[PDB]
Design a protein around this ligand. Structure first.
Ligand code: F4W
Lengths: 231, 210, 230
């Protein structure tokens, strides 16, 4: 199939909320070895956000039930198995999407805006792996999440505006990586403060294309900061 | 005729002070009465006029012409083509102080804003606002002291507070949007969704009642 | 696989909203050839309601776009193909369901409450087939939907209370079958009126706490009626 045909099916599958077909269409478009247009990049990212996100919810649900239901050697084994079936899928969704980043998306990306977007996205899918990962494997997926975020962060500081929705978006997910995964609210806040402080200082750097986009992400930062620093 | 009446009025009551702005927009979207009023305003009258409008007192004979002459200009103009990022700073409080984030409100006087982020600072470090609109008039053609390059928004022109936040310096930093640009405006198509941000977003049982 | 193990996974998959696994678990429980308990019957019915319903939405969604964008012959062809891919899925879910009804569910069901519930369901999944079906095949799926509903309806009148949530439930879907599928509002309102007026006439026997289940379904019937007479 043609690049345009796959993107039409990918746009179609989204409305139908058939995010599994939407993901397969965009995976094929990516495997063509060409740098994705802003629309293509957005279609790929929402498809996998939804596919992976669906199992992240199901996982948290079953993990919640695993703890609430604790009496039978068999009933608990039924839960462990179902939790493990969902972990298996999460790992495979993250593997397809992380392999797309390494093989095509990150190497082919030439503009800084895109090179940051995909490097932020690399940390995101490693963070999802970290949530379910255990011991030595968790150590590996946490190390990789921090590295991908940090690499994107240095690039966002050099080649990007403090009010860019991409720079702000990375700053919100990395601060959430420290607070949730590394369980360091001190590290979490420190990052969220800087990202916000730099943005409030240069609101003259807002884009007329994405101003409402930036204020939204800026609110989310300012909210987590005041929530994490409240007793 | 009506424009001639208002043009005749502004000169009869302001002389050369009004007459000095005749023919400053050789393009000419606005009338002679409209160019003059805007210039008289942009120059020095922005002080007293917005003082009277905000305080809700009776306008004087001269003020009244500058006002009806500016209103005339905002009609003719209307919503332009592209969104305009302009900045406006105040010494202390702004009428948008009571407007809660997300909700809308307006400054009872005309909203003079600049294209220069530096000349907006020149007017105060109390509140520093960034304004995105489309129904603003570029009076930079008529008056342009300190190279203000002003873009004026109408009196009681409704604005949505998109972000109101404070500096470690104390200065409250706001971002206002012209209400009439909508909800849809200001976003890059599905960017917010693709960013996959780390934040949170009638039947009973089995009978398939359709 | 143990009957209890499958039902535990089926209950688990529901909370996880993994209705495809929830459907597979209950399909296996049904294929054991034993009459399903009220809980098992309800778990099977919601699993497939959700699986089939998901494609019914996706289908209506693509179909709306199909007619609104007849601009390009290739972009339109993308539409036809995707509509047809979903029709395939719809047909296969309704085939899975109806095969379970014919082979196990309807033959094995012994109480009247059971034999009406499944015969109403048989009518529902034929109706879903009818929505996407074309010509000679549509004629067949409409004929089968009406027959399954009518068979259940006669049984519901003989062996059931006019206020039973199951009898009211069938009356609800059959009147919707006439209005949507056969496009006969006259036939639809006639059925909905009778089912309601028989239920208002004999509600004086409030089923202790079950007079919330019936009142809800009675509303949906009365509400469709007042909407159709526009
Ligand atoms: O009385 C007023 O209009 C509020 C104070 C104030 N005035 C002005 S005028 C002007 C600007 C400005 C301002 O920021 N505050 C910048 C563009 C030219």
């Amino acid at each position: 199939m043609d690049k345009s045909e796959l993107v039409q099916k990918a746009k179609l599958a989204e409305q139908a909320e058939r995010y599994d077909d939407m993901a397969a269409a965009m995976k094929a478009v990516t495997e063509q070895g060409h740098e994705l247009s802003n629309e293509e990049r957005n279609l790929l990212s929402v498809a996998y956000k939804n596919v992976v996100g669906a199992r992240r919810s199901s996982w948290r649900v079953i993990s919640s039930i695993e703890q609430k239901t604790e009496r039978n050697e068999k009933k608990q084994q039924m839960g462990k198995e179902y939790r493990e079936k969902i972990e298996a899928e999460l790992q495979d969704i993250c593997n397809d999407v992380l392999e797309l980043l390494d093989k095509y998306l990150i190497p082919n990306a030439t503009q800084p805006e895109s090179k940051v977007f995909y490097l932020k996205m690399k940390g995101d899918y490693f963070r999802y792996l970290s949530e379910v990962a255990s011991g030595d494997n968790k150590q590996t997926t946490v190390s990789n999440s921090q590295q991908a975020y940090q690499e994107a962060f240095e690039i966002s500081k050099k080649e990007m505006q403090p009010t860019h929705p991409i720079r702000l978006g990375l700053a919100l997910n990395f601060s959430v990586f420290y607070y949730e995964i590394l369980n360091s609210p001190e590290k979490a806040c420190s990052l969220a403060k800087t990202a916000f402080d730099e943005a409030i200082a240069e609101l003259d750097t807002l884009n007329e294309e994405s101003y409402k986009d930036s204020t939204l992400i800026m609110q989310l930062l300012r909210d987590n900061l005041t929530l994490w620093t409240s007793e | 005729g009506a424009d001639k009446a208002l043009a005749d009025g502004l000169v009869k009551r302001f002389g050369a002070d009004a007459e000095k702005y005749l023919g400053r927009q050789p393009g000419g979207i606005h009338s002679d009465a409209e160019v003059m009023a805007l210039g008289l305003y942009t120059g020095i009258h922005y002080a007293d006029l917005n003082r009277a409008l905000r305080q809700g007192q009776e306008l004087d004979a001269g003020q009244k012409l500058i006002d009806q002459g500016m209103s005339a200009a905002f009609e003719k103009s209307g919503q332009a083509e592209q969104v305009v990022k302009t900045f406006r700073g105040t010494r202390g409080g702004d009428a948008f102080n009571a407007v809660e984030e997300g909700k809308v409100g307006h400054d009872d006087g005309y909203l003079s804003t600049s294209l220069n982020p530096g000349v907006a600072r020149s007017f105060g470090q109390g509140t520093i606002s960034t304004v995105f609109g489309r129904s603003g008039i570029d009076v930079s053609g008529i008056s342009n002291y300190k190279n203000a390059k002003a873009i004026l928004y109408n009196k009681e022109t409704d604005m949505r507070v998109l972000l109101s936040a404070s500096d470690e310096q104390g200065v409250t930093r706001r971002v206002l949007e012209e209400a009439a640009l909508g909800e849809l405006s200001g976003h890059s198509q599905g960017l917010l969704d693709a960013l996959d941000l780390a934040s949170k977003p009638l039947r009973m049982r089995g009978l398939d009642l359709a």
